[PDB]
Amino acid sequence: RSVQWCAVSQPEATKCFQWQRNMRKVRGPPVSCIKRDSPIQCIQAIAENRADAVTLDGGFIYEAGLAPYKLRPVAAEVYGTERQPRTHYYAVAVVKKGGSFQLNELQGLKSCHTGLRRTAGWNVPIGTLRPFLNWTGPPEPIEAAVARFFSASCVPGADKGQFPNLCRLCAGTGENKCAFSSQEPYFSYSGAFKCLRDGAGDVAFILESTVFEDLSDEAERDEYELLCPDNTRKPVDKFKDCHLARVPSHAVVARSVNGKEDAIWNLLRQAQEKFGKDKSPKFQLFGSPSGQKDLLFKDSAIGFSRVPPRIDSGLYLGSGYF
Numbered sequence: 665r666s667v668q669w670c671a672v673s674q675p676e677a678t679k680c681f682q683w684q685r686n687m688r689k690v691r692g693p694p695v696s697c698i699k700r701d702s703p704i705q706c707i708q709a710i711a712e713n714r715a716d717a718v719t720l721d722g723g724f725i726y727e728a729g730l731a732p733y734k735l736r737p738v739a740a741e742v743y744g745t746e747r748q749p750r751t752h753y754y755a756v757a758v759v760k761k762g763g764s765f766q767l768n769e770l771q772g773l774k775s776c777h778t779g780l781r782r783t784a785g786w787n788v789p790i791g792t793l794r795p796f797l798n799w800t801g802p803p804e805p806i807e808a809a810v811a812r813f814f815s816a817s818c819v820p821g822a823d824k825g826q827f828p829n830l831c832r833l834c835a836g837t838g839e840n841k842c843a844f845s846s847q848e849p850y851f852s853y854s855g856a857f858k859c860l861r862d863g864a865g866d867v868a869f870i871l872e873s874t875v876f877e878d879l880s881d882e883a884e885r886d887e888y889e890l891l892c893p894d895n896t897r898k899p900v901d902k903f904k905d906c907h908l909a910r911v912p913s914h915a916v917v918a919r920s921v922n923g924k925e926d927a928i929w930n931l932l933r934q935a936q937e938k939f940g941k942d943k944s945p946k947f948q949l950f951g952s953p954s955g956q957k958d959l960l961f962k963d964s965a966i967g968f969s970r971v972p973p974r975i976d977s978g979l980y981l982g983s984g985y986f
């Protein structure tokens with residue numbers, strides 16, 4: 665019994681226990697906490713029944729759905745507002761106003777990515793850029809090809825030893841440099857945007873709402889614009905007409921057989937009502953301590969939408985496009 669959530673880092677484990685204590689306080693459905701060190705570790709933990717659920721970006725929903733795991737998305741994060749909810753988001757290329765280079769002229773420049781194999785920060789951009797890379801295909805690691813494309817980048821999760829260029833721009837100190845966690849200041853959407861804001865990189869591959877949410881002074885928004893796939897640059901609020909892709913939101917996955925979908929959904933439904941957007945001041949299901957990035961759920965998520973039965977990873981991801 666009891667849904668067992670899987671954390672991919674200590675800070676997430678910490679938030680999970682806080683979530684747990686609060687659910688108990690308000691006498692709602694209980695949630696147990698399992699701690700691991702990476703998305704792939706949680707995926708297998710769930711596959712071998714040592715955990716029941718974990719929230720994942722599209723790139724990992726894909727890996728989770730492959731054998732021998734065969735995990736399936738059961739609940740999707742919702743973004744936007746209560747009036748205008750959305751179960752999707754747009755991958756965009758944000759740059760500083762003032763430059764003239766376009767999406768097809770990134771050769772030799774500096775890049776900031778959310779993390780290795782994440783949708784908006786890697787899969788879409790490196791996919792959209794293939795024609796400009798000199799990748800000889802397997803057995804060559806796509807990483808080598810991009811590491812020789814961008815003069816330097818910050819790609820959290822990349823092997824600092826094999827492709828140092830992919831990690832050179834990362835701000836983490838010591839072994840934290842290039843970590844696929846909050847240990848790395850440039851990790852995830854907000855981190856990649858910071859990598860651009862700080863001037864470490866010339867472009868950041870993130871989603872459409874980051875600039876608007878991360879700038880405490882709206883006047884600073886005037887310093888940014890986007891790179892459109894038609895080789896032109898447009899305002900940040902014109903993302904609908906200027907994005908590299910529109911993809912389905914991150915999602916909670918579970919076993920496709922005896923995955924406890926009903927229980928997981930009941931937990932999320934109740935957790936959303938009590939600790940969701942603007943609910944309890946004691947705990948926010950969608951929020952992370954200072955410097956922490958998207959613990960357990962995206963910091964920008966506002967709720968959940970249940971995924972109808974018999975929809976595997978492939979079908980769920982099929983909603984996305986370049």
Ligand SMILES: [Fe+3]
Nearest residue numbers: 721722783784
């Ligand atoms: Fe994502």
